[PDB]
């Protein structure tokens, strides 16, 4: 599966953000769930430099369209 230059893709990244690789236990997937906005700040901070963002707003609208059209929703 690992067949790409260093650094993972964004879509997949936001995916590991939900905590797919964590203990937790009970199933946290059933109804419309939602994550926090802090995540949109962390990821956008490590990838801020990529689409000539403005400072944080433009980069904040990109990550959202990612965790908003993928599955769960994000509350900015």
From Swiss-Prot:
Keywords linked to the UniProt accession: Methylation, Ribonucleoprotein, Ribosomal protein, RNA-binding, rRNA-binding
Keyword Membrane: no
Record's keyword annotation contains Transmembrane: no
A GO molecular-function descriptor: large ribosomal subunit rRNA binding
Post-translational modification note: One or more lysine residues are methylated.
Protein family according to the UniProt entry: Belongs to the universal ribosomal protein uL11 family.
Function: Forms part of the ribosomal stalk which helps the ribosome interact with GTP-bound translation factors.
Protein name: Large ribosomal subunit protein uL11
Organism from which the protein derives: Geobacillus stearothermophilus
Residues of the full protein shown: 59 to 133 of 133
């Amino acid at each position: 599966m690992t067949f790409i230059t260093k650094t993972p893709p964004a879509a997949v990244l936001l995916k590991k953000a939900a905590g797919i690789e964590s203990g937790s236990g009970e199933p946290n997937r059933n109804k419309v769930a939602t994550i926090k906005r802090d995540k949109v700040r962390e990821i956008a901070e490590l990838k801020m430099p990529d689409l000539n963002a403005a400072s944080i707003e433009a980069a904040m609208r990109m990550i959202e369209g990612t965790a908003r059209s993928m599955g769960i929703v994000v509350e900015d």
